[PDB]
Amino acid sequence: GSEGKTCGPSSFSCPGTHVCVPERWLCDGDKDCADGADESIAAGCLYNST
Numbered sequence: 001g002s003e004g005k006t007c008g009p010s011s012f013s014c015p016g017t018h019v020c021v022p023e024r025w026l027c028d029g030d031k032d033c034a035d036g037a038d039e040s041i042a043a044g045c046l047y048n049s050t
């Protein structure tokens, strides 16, 4: 099934490749991007604070 899973409303693309990743997966712990971009500032995960 997986409805609206792959490349959801806010699908992010991993640099150096064409791999999408739903915002839900963005910085979730599972390095989907070859260089864990989604789990880094490369994806836009600046907000942290403690």
Ligand SMILES: [Ca+2]
Pocket (backbone or CB within 6 Å): 021, 025, 026, 027, 028, 029, 030, 031, 032, 033, 038, 039
């Ligand atoms: Ca991720």
